[PDB]
């Protein structure tokens, strides 16, 4: 208990504080065709003929 | 009465369980139109005339 007078100190917390900058950063549409186009292979593996014709 | 301690054994069942793979297998649409071909015929079937002209 730190007692000075009639005032008491209970804890010191520590804190982290952001400020921001103008700075930005995005990213691109480009990819999403190529996902597009490994995605859909999928939809033909996993598929069997039992019987040749 | 099976009893040991104060433990009774009632039942024992046997059961069977199912562990998927990956492969499939799906039906063709082509034997539809043939169906329908061979369906429609019975339209014209069992129906007569009377009379000749």
Same mark, same amino acid.
């Given at each position: ?20 900058? =103008? ?7 480009? =990819?999403?065709?190529? /996902?597009? /186009?490994? /995605? ?14």
């Amino acid at each position: 208990m730190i007692l000075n007078n009639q005032e008491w100190l209970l804890a010191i917390f520590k804190k982290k504080g952001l400020t921001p900058t =103008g700075k930005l950063e995005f990213a691109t549409i480009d =990819g999403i065709d190529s /996902a597009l /186009a490994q /995605a859909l292979n999928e939809a033909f593996d996993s598929q069997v003929v039992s019987f040749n014709d």
